[PDB]
Design an enzyme around this catalytic site. Sequence first.
Site, PDB file in Angstrom:
ATOM      1  CG  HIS A  46      65.796 -31.530  21.397  1.00 21.09           C
ATOM      2  ND1 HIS A  46      65.802 -30.163  21.365  1.00 21.09           N
ATOM      3  CD2 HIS A  46      65.295 -31.929  20.210  1.00 21.09           C
ATOM      4  CE1 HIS A  46      65.352 -29.750  20.202  1.00 21.09           C
ATOM      5  NE2 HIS A  46      65.041 -30.802  19.481  1.00 21.09           N
ATOM      6  CG  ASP A  97      67.337 -28.694  23.982  1.00 22.59           C
ATOM      7  OD1 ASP A  97      68.153 -29.627  23.824  1.00 22.59           O
ATOM      8  OD2 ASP A  97      66.393 -28.465  23.193  1.00 22.59           O
ATOM      9  N   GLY A 196      63.472 -29.821  12.657  1.00 21.08           N
ATOM     10  CA  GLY A 196      64.719 -29.926  11.906  1.00 21.08           C
ATOM     11  C   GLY A 196      65.639 -28.714  12.028  1.00 21.08           C
ATOM     12  CB  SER A 198      66.196 -28.735  17.094  1.00 27.34           C
ATOM     13  OG  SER A 198      64.816 -28.545  17.389  1.00 27.34           O
TER      14      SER A 198
END
Length: 246
Positions: A46, A97, A196, A198
């Site tokens: 993502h 993801d 942030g 991720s």
Amino acid sequence: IIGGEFTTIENQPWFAAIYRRHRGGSVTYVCGGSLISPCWVISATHCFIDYPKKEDYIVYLGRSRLNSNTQGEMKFEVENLILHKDYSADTLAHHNDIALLKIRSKEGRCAQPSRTIQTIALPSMYNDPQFGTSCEITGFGKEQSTDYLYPEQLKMTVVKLISHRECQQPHYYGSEVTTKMLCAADPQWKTDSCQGDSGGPLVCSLQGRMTLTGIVSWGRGCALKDKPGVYTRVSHFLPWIRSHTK
Ligand SMILES: NCc1ccc(Br)cc1
């Protein structure tokens, strides 16, 4: 990271800081990652789906600060940006993801271990720790959901793996959470990953070894009651990882 503490790269030497080059020449932070081998950083699809050209990204290892230099840091370009073919996103949840970045220096070298740079172990196929186990998360993400700036110093905190059963409950995420994910949160909901963070690591002790058990993926807000952090379950993606790391 909401709550937790400021740390340095030596305490999380697998942490990779991923930035994007901008027209107009600005460079801004994208997401975290983890160094799983000398040439390979693992992160979340993502982070990259909107702008999928590898040429746009820069990976730093050995970096303790967001927008200034750390002694021993190493800058890399992205030789191969591999996003998961089956990625999709719900209103909340993201699925499959997971992403790989093959890294090389302009001089063509992959990562060399040091005081500030180390690889992190993958878990063995389908092997995760039990619920209630304490794990650590790390990142440059927001310190408060409402903030507009990222903190300048790297942070980490501790969270506890929550059962699928319990992350199923409708006051949590219900159908949205799947067996390709793990949930983790604070028992009192006072600390969490945030925007942030991720792509960064969820690290648990497994067979007396720090192991990359999760990848920061999504959550309802940050540190909100009954809304734990959701993570890509690394142990269920080894075939994807081994295949694409060749
Ligand atoms: N996608 C940003 C984000 C990730 C984890 C939590 Br918890 C909150 C927000």
